[PDB]
Design an enzyme around this catalytic site. Structure first.
Site, short mmCIF file in Angstrom:
data_model
loop_
_atom_site.label_atom_id
_atom_site.label_comp_id
_atom_site.label_asym_id
_atom_site.label_seq_id
_atom_site.Cartn_x
_atom_site.Cartn_y
_atom_site.Cartn_z
N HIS A 25 49.60 -35.38 57.83
CA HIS A 25 50.27 -36.76 57.78
C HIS A 25 49.11 -37.72 58.60
O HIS A 25 49.42 -38.57 58.98
CB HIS A 25 51.89 -36.25 57.73
CG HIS A 25 52.03 -35.94 58.92
ND1 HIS A 25 52.47 -34.73 59.58
CD2 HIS A 25 51.54 -36.90 60.43
CE1 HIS A 25 52.72 -34.37 60.84
NE2 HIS A 25 52.28 -35.95 61.39
N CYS A 44 53.24 -32.86 66.71
CA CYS A 44 52.13 -31.77 65.29
C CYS A 44 51.23 -32.01 66.04
O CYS A 44 50.01 -32.13 66.44
CB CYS A 44 52.65 -33.41 64.63
SG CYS A 44 54.06 -34.22 63.49
N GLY A 89 53.93 -36.74 68.83
CA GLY A 89 52.56 -36.64 69.22
C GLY A 89 52.80 -35.25 69.35
O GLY A 89 51.44 -35.07 69.71
C1 LIG Z 1 61.11 -38.14 63.46
C2 LIG Z 1 61.06 -38.49 62.28
C3 LIG Z 1 62.23 -39.76 61.76
C4 LIG Z 1 60.45 -38.91 62.54
C5 LIG Z 1 60.73 -37.74 61.05
N1 LIG Z 1 61.14 -37.29 60.62
C6 LIG Z 1 61.64 -37.73 59.74
O1 LIG Z 1 61.19 -38.15 58.43
C7 LIG Z 1 63.12 -36.25 58.06
F1 LIG Z 1 64.16 -37.31 58.30
F2 LIG Z 1 62.44 -35.79 57.20
F3 LIG Z 1 63.16 -35.60 59.34
C8 LIG Z 1 59.42 -36.99 61.55
O2 LIG Z 1 59.16 -35.86 62.34
N2 LIG Z 1 57.80 -37.30 60.86
C9 LIG Z 1 57.90 -38.34 59.80
C10 LIG Z 1 56.19 -38.08 59.36
C11 LIG Z 1 55.35 -37.08 60.47
C12 LIG Z 1 56.50 -36.61 60.92
C13 LIG Z 1 56.58 -36.89 62.22
O3 LIG Z 1 56.74 -37.87 62.81
N3 LIG Z 1 55.87 -35.94 62.87
C14 LIG Z 1 55.84 -35.78 64.40
C15 LIG Z 1 54.28 -35.32 64.97
N4 LIG Z 1 53.82 -35.90 65.47
C16 LIG Z 1 56.61 -34.82 65.58
C17 LIG Z 1 58.39 -35.50 65.75
C18 LIG Z 1 58.46 -36.68 66.16
C19 LIG Z 1 59.92 -37.11 66.75
N5 LIG Z 1 60.12 -34.93 67.45
C20 LIG Z 1 59.05 -34.63 66.44
O4 LIG Z 1 58.71 -33.11 66.48
C21 LIG Z 1 56.15 -36.96 58.72
C22 LIG Z 1 57.46 -36.47 58.01
C23 LIG Z 1 55.34 -37.10 57.48
#
Ligand SMILES: CC(C)(C)[C@H](NC(=O)C(F)(F)F)C(=O)N1C[C@H]2[C@@H]([C@H]1C(=O)N[C@H](C=N)C[C@@H]1CCNC1=O)C2(C)C
Ligand SMILES: CC(C)(C)[C@H](NC(=O)C(F)(F)F)C(=O)N1C[C@H]2[C@@H]([C@H]1C(=O)N[C@H](C=N)C[C@@H]1CCNC1=O)C2(C)C
Lengths: 299, 299
Positions: A39, A143, A141
């Protein structure tokens, strides 16, 4: 008896920062390949409903900025394995440990090295829940942070972090990019299945309590495996198998408490509660220590 | 919120083993000095009643086996500072991080890298209790394992492990060899004193709950610091210092809840109980997260 993570140094030497466009997250640098969540390639519009193969074919090597500390690593190739991007770089990581990629089963534990901008921040122990989430601590951040176990200088990587669900639990993939659980790397509301408690781990932790001089929860009763499992299932606990009973063997032999006698203790705890008492400082029954975890710490 | 240790890699690269006779413990190799507990020089008879000055005077450099793994580091000098031995070696450790030696206060937390035979085994978070013990997890051979915090790549070493008390808690020194608390490095009857709850950390936990939207316990009262301290002591809570008030500054500013207003909220919980309500999904007030730990996990 503490929640204990593996030493993180062997993994710290593998963390890098990956930037594509507007998005920065972490990658895992082993030999001449950097693994990271795919992503990273999405814009804030793409991420709401990405077609990943269509998006990735439109990227060039120079779209990926990989930084190890202060040094930029040049990307010379890139491919996708499920939800993980593999960036080939022109430099081999001299700090690459002996390693393996493994897919863990629910109830198994691992250590997480939480990282931001390619720099390690913290380390803690997690369990893969029966619903395939993890109860982690991850921020924006994070991920590309990984989970792992260490066995005599060999690092077994089992988790890469991708997302946080609305309930605050976390979801990610193995290092082959396959999600644990029914989740997808798309920003859209997603819920997990109803979770259950890891019975074999609760029992291991009760044994850890006895090894550390606490016996208040024991009783003089016995149970059969099947009768215990009926009560366990009623309380949303996972089934206990004969394999679990065998795995608990060392702990039963060390304490002299038969596995099915410990099951009768746990049954009483489930039916009567803890009446405001604590076990190993905990007011709730702890299910994120495996039998191996207890043995490794207690001996 | 979960207990999160610092990444241990910078400390792992400094762990060595130190053997005298048949006793092997761990040491910390920084630049060309190895620091370790002085009781490495004792035999199992000496420990019951040691005369450390006389034991040291009989030792020579050639009696000390210092090893990084199985690689021997030649000892070129030895001296004793309080309860630590300092062994000068002929090689400066190329993995020496930027570091400081610090003496911590009760309530402060730190990461422990538990080691055996110079080999790191696990990492976990500990708090120094008001009775100057830690609730560690340590087995035979763990002495010389250290506790530390990391701030911008600088490792602050604060604890070296020496002993286990009969209640199962642990005692040790700073890196200048001065014990925390009234303990001595002799195998003789010793006991941890009565402990108290770390008020500043409970307050940090309440701020953490407020940050996350759990704020039912906020009341419409305030208190003075002196009035609060006198009441807290009647509930076996530590009094607050001026430094404690200041370390709560950032959390107070982030939430808009004045420190003394939060003290009045905690006083009400102490006087009337929680009434079956929970805070952050817990019926117990947690006292091993510092204000920095709360901030560290949301930043
Ligand atoms: C938190 C949220 C609303 C954003 C979203 N979740 C859903 O959309 C859900 F509803 F599907 F869960 C979500 O995590 N993302 C949206 C997008 C990536 C991921 C993401 O931003 N990952 C972060 C990596 N750096 C780590 C996150 C940040 C907060 N704490 C974490 O661990 C992807 C699923 C492709
Ligand atoms: C617990 C024991 C009854 C053995 C004893 N405790 C008391 O005498 C006390 F009660 F007084 F404290 C303690 O004797 N030791 C005796 C001798 C050193 C210390 C010791 O063995 N340290 C170990 C370092 N490798 C770590 C220990 C091992 C078990 N778990 C630990 O953490 C010294 C005080 C000089």
């Amino acid at each position: 008896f503490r929640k204990m993570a593996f030493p993180s140094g062997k993994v710290e030497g593998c963390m890098v920062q990956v930037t594509c466009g507007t998005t920065t997250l972490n990658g895992l640098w082993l030999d001449d390949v950097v693994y990271c969540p795919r992503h990273v390639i999405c814009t804030s519009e793409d991420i709401l409903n990405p077609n990943y193969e269509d998006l990735l074919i439109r990227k060039s090597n120079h779209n990926f900025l990989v930084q190890a500390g202060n040094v930029q690593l040049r990307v010379i190739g890139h491919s996708m394995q499920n939800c993980v991007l593999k960036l080939k770089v022109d430099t081999a990581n001299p700090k690459t440990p002996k390693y393996k990629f493994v897919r863990i089963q629910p109830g198994q534990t691992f250590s997480v090295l939480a990282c931001y901008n390619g720099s390690p921040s913290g380390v803690y122990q997690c369990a893969m829940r029966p619903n395939f989430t993890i109860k982690g601590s991850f921020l924006n951040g994070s991920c590309g942070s990984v989970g792992f176990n260490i066995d005599y200088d060999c690092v077994s990587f089992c988790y890469m972090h991708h997302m946080e669900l609305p309930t605050g639990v976390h979801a990610g993939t193995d290092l082959e990019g396959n999600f644990y659980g029914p989740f997808v790397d798309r920003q859209t509301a997603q819920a997990a299945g109803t979770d259950t408690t890891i019975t074999v781990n609760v029992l291991a932790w009760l044994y850890a309590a006895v090894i550390n001089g606490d016996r208040w929860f024991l009783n003089r009763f016995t149970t059969t495996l099947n009768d215990f499992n009926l009560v366990a299932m009623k309380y949303n606990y996972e089934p206990l198998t004969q394999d679990h009973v065998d795995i608990l063997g060392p702990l039963s032999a060390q304490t002299g408490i038969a596995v099915l006698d410990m099951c009768a203790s746990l049954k009483e705890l489930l039916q009567n509660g803890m009446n405001g008492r604590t076990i190993l400082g905990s007011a709730l029954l702890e299910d994120e220590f495996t039998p191996f975890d207890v043995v490794r710490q207690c001996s």
